[PDB]
Amino acid sequence: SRYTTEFHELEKIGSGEFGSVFKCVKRLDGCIYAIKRSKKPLAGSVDEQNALREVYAHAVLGQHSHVVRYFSAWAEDDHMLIQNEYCNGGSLADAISENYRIMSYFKEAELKDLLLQVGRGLRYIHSMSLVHMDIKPSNIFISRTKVMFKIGDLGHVTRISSPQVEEGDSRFLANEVLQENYTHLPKADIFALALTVVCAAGAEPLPRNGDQWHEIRQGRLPRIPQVLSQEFTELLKVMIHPDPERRPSAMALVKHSVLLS
């Protein structure tokens, strides 16, 4: 087995209906990688389509400092394996959970740093005529150097041009995508990034549906318990503007005065 041959398992760092993720050291270079191991999906299925989006997204993207680097992908023994960069800080979701446990928080400055860094990742992805379509804390990963935020889980990535949309988490989904309007998909990533930052900011668990879900798509923010400048607030507000054309592009976002730097 190539997996056992090329790598030594150190620890399981993830599990679910996607299979498992392992922290592994590669014997040859002594470096650490996150390897996802999963049952090879049924030919022609959803998870196969989702899985191929991931492979063919790397084929295009290459390498960027705010996107989790992809090294290789293979299949064997009726499983598929994908070898990615290992980010020692876990995901933003883990960090948010840890913040509540020990009762710390991300300073307003650190919220802005998060927004800029992920924003840079998004600008790169969008420049390659791709959209991520599943931005949320659990898909943002952290490397501690003094910190790098990196976009991961490319399983929903689709083309801007000929988009094949597997809808992302309902909690971070812009209404126009739910309305099968795919004419401005980059702006959906922006919408989801705003709510991601609001989660980091200490806001309550986002609604999956119902009234409060709609109230957000009406362009109003969840309550943030920290003291954020009225202008950082206004940046986040316009990022969930009902009209996705009023939302800034990724490139407009990373050049914003509020975030420099």
Ligand SMILES: C=CCn1c(=O)c2cnc(Nc3ccc(N4CCN(C)CC4)c(F)c3)nc2n1-c1cccc(C(C)(C)O)n1
């Ligand atoms: C290759 C699979 C995708 N993926 C990466 O590319 C990837 C890159 N880096 C890390 N770093 C990392 C993730 C999680 C912990 N843990 C915190 C919770 N526990 C306390 C244990 C440690 C940690 F320490 C480091 N993780 C990565 N991935 C990962 C891991 C788990 C689940 C998922 C899913 C649900 C598929 O998105 N992904």
Ligand SMILES: [Cl-]
């Ligand atoms: Cl657009």
